[PDB]
Amino acid sequence: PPKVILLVEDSKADSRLVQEVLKTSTIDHELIILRDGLAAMAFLQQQGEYENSPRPNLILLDLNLPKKDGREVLAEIKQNPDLKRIPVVVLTTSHNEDDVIASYELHVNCYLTKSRNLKDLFKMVQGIESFWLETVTLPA
């Protein structure tokens, strides 16, 4: 039963980077990428055509998204009894203290600020993979 990872990111460059890191991952997984907050909620809530969507074991979320603020996605995921158990890793450009605090207040599992260079973002995502997919004991 490979781990299902949901990435909510609209930046092609950033999503392709995540795919590349996970590409050589030794842990069998399935990466699903959505580009906006409305698609993300529909998928997670398994609404309509998404009724057969797989439950993610881990969610990578950028607070800055098209169609629906990732901050709303975070809040709605963490207040939903059927989804709040799923670990959410915020990976965003935003770094102001107010955003960080509010995000942890909404119960985000961890907040990561995307590195200024892709070379470093690559290593950051490698860190996400190693910790959440190989070190952590995820909920069933």
Which contacts (CB < 8 Å, 24+ apart) does range 50-57 have? 54/4, 54/30, 55/4, 55/86, 56/4, 56/5, 56/6, 56/32, 56/86, 57/3, 57/4, 57/5, 57/86, 57/138
Tell me how far, at minimum, the Cβ of 54 lies from a second copy, in Å: 16
131 binds a second copy (CB under 8 A): yes
16 binds a second copy (CB under 8 A): no
| Binding residues for a second copy, total number by CB under 8 A | 28
Within the chain, strands assigned E span 3-8, 29-34, 58-61, 88-92, 110-113
Tell me how far, at minimum, the Cβ of 81 lies from a second copy, in Å: 8
Contact positions with a second copy (CB under 8 A) in 39-98: 84-87, 95, 97
User: Which residue number, 19 or 93, has a Cβ lying nearer to a second copy?
Assistant: 93
Take residue 77 and report the two structure tokens written for it. 């995921």
Tell me how far, at minimum, the Cβ of 100 lies from a second copy, in Å: 5
Q: Burial, 77: exposed, middle or buried (Cβ in 10 Å; 0-12, 13-18, 19+)?
A: buried
Which one among 4, 29, 113, 122 touches a second copy, defined by CB under 8 A? Answer: 113
Using CB under 8 A as the criterion, which residues of the chain lie in contact with a second copy when the complex forms?
84-87, 95, 97, 100-101, 104-105, 107, 109-113, 124, 127-128, 130-132, 135-140
